[PDB]
Design a binder for these strands. Structure first.
Ligand SMILES: O=C1Nc2ccccc2/C1=C1/Nc2ccccc2C1=O
Lengths: 327, 290
DNA sequence: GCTTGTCACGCGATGCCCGAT
DNA sequence: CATCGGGCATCGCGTGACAAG
């Protein structure tokens, strides 16, 4: 042996001692490096120091053993109900903490993210905004690196003093704590194999739906009974397509075939879905009897394209809004 | 510059920054343990950090620390209800600082009994048969607060939690449960009403016109937003536009804005006739700021 | 087959400790 | 009470082996 070797061996033994104490599974610990070991040790100490100041149960007249067991997992229940993950970031843009579910949403292990620069997980065009929210309530949107490209995510949180961080001065004196962002990050919200869905709907002569096939129930969300108790089809049609649909209804009355039109229908989720439909009159004894509309759902993009290429310029054509439907 | 020399310099710089990071983390450890801050070398700092971690000590945080972080970040209270009956299987203490209600008022109860009746049916559509997110009105004369709920559907009973024989849950036999968090929270626009005045379609421009979101208007009668002096005028307008199908009727009234402020609005209304039966589907209104 | 990174090791320049001045 | 050289310990630097991606 030699002095350098023995000193390095002592240092490495202390590093292995630190690694064996980290609050992570053994498979996570074994694949760690010395720098990550020290980083996670510092992170654990800082978290415990903060909770030593900030922190510290079912009601006493409502205690049952099952409810106590649920209380012992209340935190994980909240985490799973977040539909996203927790993120505590310091003024130094360091990830003070990230909940495990980050791996479920971005593909990053929480052991590789904690005590690292948060900007490493953000889109550059959004980084300038993030620190803007870093320096009491906060509700913004940023795009974060997603290893499952990027992912747009809404952040809802606050700025609170991260106590117990023992920031020491030039004088060796303790400094007051800095603000830190405590945030919950969730994804955003606005068709699949149903692109090849071609479904048919039967209607009365006034376009009151009286029948619907299975793919129609899957696309529009109504049961066959629910689709009929809500009046004619004009109660389902977007207000930007009402007069277009009415003109093509007049065309169908005067010809028996409406041709291919692209319009928006209201689902049971109170959502709008584009359809390419063709209504045909079916006759009984030479007198019209009922309409048979055979349609295909469209993505919002190609629906907007069809609306842009509308032959008829009609009022409310470029209007957007929400609707409800009653019986 | 030859590539081997540049590679060697990059490698040396990487190792230098690596040693820098190691010493900085050792300094942070010295700042983080008791008597180091109150000067030691790297070995003593590492040994004292080992002892401190041994005294402190799988998850990085505890369940209580995680709950604390989530609640400090975005408030809320956890509730676990059954999908069949809505029976409140669990409610956290955070319901008291959120709804001003004790845990007793929710336990042994059902979620439909805790929400506004006008939401009950909606609630059912969120409980029958992964993720869920809705908005309802919860209790606290009685009083209600708009609560945003987001959660998921978990197969009951939960793994790891022991269910004793003499427990009130032993005989329930629920198969799924909603585990959720509840939190407290000169232009014109077009609209579509029924014959009675109920908003059935609301343009998104209403936000810039009256300060309301479309969901805040849909379902409500427009007369509810009208000044009591102007209410009979608006009602007679809605009644007369039905008798005069095709004709356009304009009326000025006072709309109660989002800030409970009166705005002078001109609403021009006409009717949409079915191309076959010539019946009135709805009333199209254009509501313009004045 | 290149790139970035981890770990060990050789190597001196100081550090600490401490009999011996 | 210091100061002074021993020998081992600390510590920062550069480089080479080796591997993951
Ligand atoms: O193709 C439809 N599928 C539907 C499902 C539910 C309710 C209505 C419709 C459809 C209409 N196609 C039309 C064409 C011209 C005028 C009116 C209409 C409609 O109401």
């Amino acid at each position: 042996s030699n002095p350098s070797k023995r000193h390095r061996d002592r240092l490495n033994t202390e590093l292995d001692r630190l690694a064996s104490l980290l609050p992570f599974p053994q498979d996570v610990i074994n694949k760690l490096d010395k720098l990550s070991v020290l980083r996670l040790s510092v992170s654990y100490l800082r978290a415990k120091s903060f909770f030593d100041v900030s922190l510290k149960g079912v009601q006493d007249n409502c205690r049952t053993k099952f409810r106590e067991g649920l209380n012992l997992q209340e935190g994980e229940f909240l985490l799973q109900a977040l539909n996203g993950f927790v993120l505590v970031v310091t003024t130094d843009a360091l990830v003070f903490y990230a909940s495990s579910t980050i791996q479920d949403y971005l593909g990053f292990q929480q052991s590789d993210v904690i005590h690292q620069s948060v900007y490493e997980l953000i889109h550059t065009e959004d980084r300038a905004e993030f620190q803007r929210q870093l320096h009491m309530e906060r509700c913004f949107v940023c795009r974060l690196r997603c290893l499952l490209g990027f992912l747009a995510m809404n952040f809802q949180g606050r700025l609170k003093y991260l106590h117990g961080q023992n920031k020491k001065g030039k004088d060796g004196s303790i400094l007051p704590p800095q603000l830190a962002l405590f945030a919950i990050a969730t994804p955003l919200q606005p068709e699949i194999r149903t692109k090849n869905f071609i479904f048919r709907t039967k209607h009365k002569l006034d376009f009151t739906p009286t029948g619907c096939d299975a793919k129609g129930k899957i696309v529009l969300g109504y049961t066959e009974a629910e689709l009929c108790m809500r009046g004619t089809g004009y109660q389902f049609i977007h207000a930007a397509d009402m007069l277009y649909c009415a003109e093509y209804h007049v065309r169908m009355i005067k010809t028996g075939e409406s041709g291919m039109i692209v319009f928006r229908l209201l689902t049971k989720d109170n959502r709008w879905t584009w359809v390419q439909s063709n209504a045909r009159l079916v006759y009984k004894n030479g007198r019209p009897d009922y309409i048979i509309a055979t349609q295909r759902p469209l993505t919002d993009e190609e629906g907007k394209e069809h609306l842009r290429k509308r032959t008829l310029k009609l009022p409310f054509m470029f209007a957007t809004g929400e609707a409800v439907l009653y019986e | 510059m030859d590539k081997e020399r540049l590679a060697r310099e990059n490698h040396s710089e990487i190792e230098r920054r690596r040693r820098n990071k190691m010493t900085a983390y050792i300094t942070e450890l010295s700042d983080m343990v008791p008597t180091c801050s109150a000067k030691p070398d790297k070995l003593t700092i590492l040994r004292m950090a080992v002892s401190h971690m041994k005294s402190l000590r799988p998850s990085f945080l505890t369940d209580q620390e995680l709950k604390h972080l989530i609640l400090e970040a975005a408030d809320g209270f956890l509730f676990i209800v059954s999908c069949e009956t809505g029976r409140v299987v669990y409610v956290s203490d955070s319901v008291t600082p959120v709804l001003n209600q004790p845990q007793s008022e929710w336990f042994g109860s059902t979620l439909y009994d805790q929400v506004h009746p006008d939401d009950v049916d909606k609630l059912r559509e969120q409980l029958s048969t992964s993720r869920r997110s809705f908005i309802c009105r919860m209790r606290c004369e009685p009083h209600f607060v708009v609560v945003h709920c987001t959660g998921y559907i978990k197969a009951w009973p939960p793994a790891g939690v022991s269910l004793p024989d003499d427990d009130p849950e032993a005989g329930q036999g629920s198969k799924f449960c909603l585990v959720a968090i509840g939190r407290l929270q000169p232009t014109e626009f077009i609209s579509r009403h029924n014959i009675e005045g109920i908003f059935t379609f609301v343009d998104h421009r209403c936000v810039a016109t009256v300060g309301y979101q479309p969901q805040e208007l849909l379902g409500k009668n427009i007369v509810e937003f009208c000044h009591p002096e102007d209410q009979q005028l608006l009602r007679d307008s809605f009644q007369q536009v039905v008798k005069l199908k095709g004709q356009v009727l304009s009326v000025m009234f006072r709309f109660r804005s989002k800030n409970q402020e009166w705005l002078w609005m001109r609403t021009s209304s006409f009717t949409f006739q079915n191309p076959y039966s010539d019946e009135i589907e709805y009333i199209i209104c254009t509501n313009t700021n004045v």
